[PDB]
Amino acid sequence: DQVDHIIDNIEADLKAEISDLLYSETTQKRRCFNTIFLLGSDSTTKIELKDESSRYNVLIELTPKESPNVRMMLRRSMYKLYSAADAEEHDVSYDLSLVENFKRLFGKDLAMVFNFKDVDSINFNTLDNFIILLKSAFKYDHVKISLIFNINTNLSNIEKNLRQSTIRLLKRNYHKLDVSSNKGF
Amino acid sequence: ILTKEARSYLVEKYKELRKDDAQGFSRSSYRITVRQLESMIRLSEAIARANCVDEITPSFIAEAYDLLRQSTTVTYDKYVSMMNMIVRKIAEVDREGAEELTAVDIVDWYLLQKENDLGSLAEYWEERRLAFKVIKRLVKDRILMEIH
């Protein structure tokens, strides 16, 4: 009982800190998705979102298994987010068009967040190409994106593999939030 | 003798002349041992005997070190000497909090520097043009960053 007590304590702590840091960071640039790194992340940490009526908050989770190439990542993600817009909504191209049509096709503006489940094993060239792809979505202004990196460890490992020109795209507003059951005990 | 505090200097310098050598992984140098340090002592002393001056001064150690370490454009040594003197000058002006330094101020700084250059005024006109060539060259180079 005391075990599960402290367990739920730490769990609610993690959910709270991530939900907090996910918002309130009004960065006047507003042309680059904000990134949230999870240092030492177990990659098993579930995430919740604000209900936030008048704007869908759709979570997207990508596994290193879901990522054979760029095209299939894009399609799987598009299908997932479209199914979620349907569940919130009650013929569509699995592509970027679904973004801008989104408003016309669902009314409320969109705000997605990507949760790369276990990044260290994904082939970083693919992920890089995918991020450069996503960058194009910033010409519609009815959507905003945010990234949730679940690095297993070693932020240096990540910044060793990506194209530096894309790091300089992520580095717009990052937050080195840690998620480690082992920290100062 | 080594009475000048170049002594201390020399010690530190030898350090890097070991560090720059990186045989394997912190494995001993091929080319340099402590005998080379004793050699630096002797080379210094010998340069002193050359200039006919006792009590080796750190600049001597510097020359001995660089001589021991080896293995448009105009006469290369002259250009690099211009570079060294001008950079020292600008560093001193930096430390002293002096206001600024202009190209013509530097050319007159050399006017100061090389008067035993001698020759003729024609030479001065020529050496002046050379100085301007060199300073604009550094500009075109990336040594000192310009302003305004």
């Binding site: 006047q28 095209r71 260290d120 240096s156 300089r168 | -």
Partner: protein, 422 residues
């Protein structure tokens, strides 16, 4: 007869583009190749040309936002049909399914069906279809560029409307494969440093003179009310400064600079005072502590444990030590540079049990931390991701560079300079 605009560094290109493109579909060639590397403003000079000449008609596509030629075709179809519906609201029309086309010939048939009905036009008119970055399509093949070149011929010659393409591409290693077609092309060379600074300042003064942080610090400091030029002066000065100080690091990019500027502008603002605004010199001499390092990084004492430290430090030993020597230098009685050779299991365990400080024979925590490693992708397998944990043909190799090896060695106090000898 067309109004050629002016661009700060596209004079020749502006002229030749307005020369290869006009209203008359007859004197307008079929295709066109705006070539050049990313950072020359093709997507911008072309836009600033079209906005100067609105009488004509164009479509703008983003081949990078699409992925393959299938969505490419479908998007071309939908954009063309909508553009025509919105270009002549009067003519009745039957829209064809843009999601029906899946083959390059289906596209031609559909376009023919779309154009045959517009034969009520008063004159031959052009339609410039812009593909912005036909190179960067993630599934390019040798047989796509010509596939799109040839659509001019298949389409009827006397249609009231004339589709004319404008391709955009980079990596001249691609355009070379199609020289013999002799399609007219324009090249955009990358800029020199000075013109880079010019473009950058004239494009970002509007951002920096009126950004939030500087204007804030205006009232946040002694007011010292001044004219717009003072902010112009200081902004342009910072621009020349950052570019002349980071050029050698960034090259002749325009985007990388448009990132460094925004990463180093807020702090630079913070390091301004009441006086330096009329003195860029001391302003620089004060803010210096940033001008000399990218700070674009956002050796770690890896969380891993003792047994893991030794596992890793032993699995590194055959990045130079082939099994020919290990049983010699490790018995119980330079390839530091090159990519590491492949281990095999039970050799790792061998060297481990050797250099672990008879003390330990248990292997549950050992393999536990081994799997931990392999999840951290520090010692990855050349073979697949699922059968590695059998014992089929399978090789293991370290994916950590040598500096972290030095770190792990010193921290664990075991020395490694021995086992490497040359």
């Amino acid at each position: 007869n067309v109004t050629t605009p002016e661009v700060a560094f596209r004079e020749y290109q502006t002229n030749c583009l307005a020369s290869y493109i006009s209203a008359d579909p007859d004197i307008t060639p079929s295709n066109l190749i705006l070539q050049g590397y990313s950072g020359t403003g093709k997507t911008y000079t072309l836009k600033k040309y079209f906005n100067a000449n609105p009488n004509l008609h164009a479509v703008w596509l983003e081949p990078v936002e699409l992925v393959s030629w299938k969505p490419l075709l479908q998007a071309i179809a939908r954009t063309v049909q909508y553009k025509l519906k919105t270009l002549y609201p009067n003519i009745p029309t039957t829209d064809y399914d843009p999601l029906q086309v899946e083959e390059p010939f289906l596209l031609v048939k559909t376009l023919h069906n779309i154009f045959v009905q517009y034969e009520s036009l008063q004159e031959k008119t052009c339609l410039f279809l812009i593909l912005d970055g036909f190179d960067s399509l993630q599934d390019l093949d040798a047989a796509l560029f010509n596939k799109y070149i040839k659509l001019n011929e298949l389409l009827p010659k006397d249609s009231k409307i004339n589709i004319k393409f404008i391709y955009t591409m980079l990596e001249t290693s691609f355009l070379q494969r199609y020289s013999t077609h002799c399609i007219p092309t324009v090249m955009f060379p990358r800029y020199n440093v000075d013109e880079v600074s010019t473009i950058l300042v004239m494009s970002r003064c509007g951002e920096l003179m009126e950004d939030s942080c500087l204007r804030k610090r205006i009232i946040e400091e002694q007011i010292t009310d001044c004219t717009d030029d003072q902010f112009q002066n200081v902004a342009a000065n910072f621009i020349h400064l950052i570019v002349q100080a980071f050029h050698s690091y960034t090259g002749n990019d325009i985007f990388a600079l448009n990132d460094l500027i925004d990463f180093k502008w807020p702090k630079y603002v913070s390091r301004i005072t009441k006086e330096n605004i009329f003195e860029p010199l001391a302003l620089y001499k004060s803010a210096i502590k940033l001008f000399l390092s990218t700070d674009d990084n956002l050796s770690q004492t890896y969380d891993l444990s003792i047994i893991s430290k030794y596992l890793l430090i032993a699995s590194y030993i055959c990045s130079y030590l082939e099994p020919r020597y290990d049983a010699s230098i490790f018995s119980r009685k330079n390839p530091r540079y090159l990519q590491p050779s492949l281990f095999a299991i039970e050799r790792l365990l061998a060297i481990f049990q050797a250099i672990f400080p008879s003390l330990m024979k248990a292997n549950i925590e050992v393999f536990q931390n081994l799997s931990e490693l392999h999840t951290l992708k520090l010692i990855a397998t050349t073979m697949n991701k699922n059968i590695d944990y059998l014992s089929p043909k399978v090789r293991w190799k370290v994916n950590v560079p040598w500096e972290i090896i030095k770190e792990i060695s010193e921290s664990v106090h075991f020395n490694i300079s021995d086992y490497f000898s040359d």
